[PDB]
Design a protein around this ligand. Structure first.
Ligand SMILES: [Zn+2]
Ligand SMILES: [Zn+2]
Length: 72
C-alpha cells in the first residue's frame, strides 16, 4: 500500500525488478542467492519444490520425501 520492501532475504541487499530475481511465499531472493537447502545449487534457473522454509530441487525434494532407513 504505502511502500514496498522486496529486498533479498539471503544477503539483505535490495532486489531490483530490472534484473533476474526470485520470490516465493512472499520473500525475495537473488537469482544467485536463491539456492537449494540440500545441494546448495542455484535454483534460480532449475526447478525445485518449496518446502518448510526450505528450497529443495526436484531430487532434493523427492529424496527427502522418500521412505527409507537412510541415515543421511
Ligand atoms: Zn542476495
Ligand atoms: Zn538440491
Amino acid at each position: 500500500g504505502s511502500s514496498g520492501s522486496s529486498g533479498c532475504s539471503a544477503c539483505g541487499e535490495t532486489v531490483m525488478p530490472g534484473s533476474r530475481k526470485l520470490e516465493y511465499g512472499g520473500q525475495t531472493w537473488h537469482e544467485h542467492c536463491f539456492l537449494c537447502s540440500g545441494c546448495e545449487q542455484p535454483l534460480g534457473s532449475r526447478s525445485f519444490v518449496p518446502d518448510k522454509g526450505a528450497h529443495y530441487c526436484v531430487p532434493c525434494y523427492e529424496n527427502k520425501f522418500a521412505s527409507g532407513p537412510s541415515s543421511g
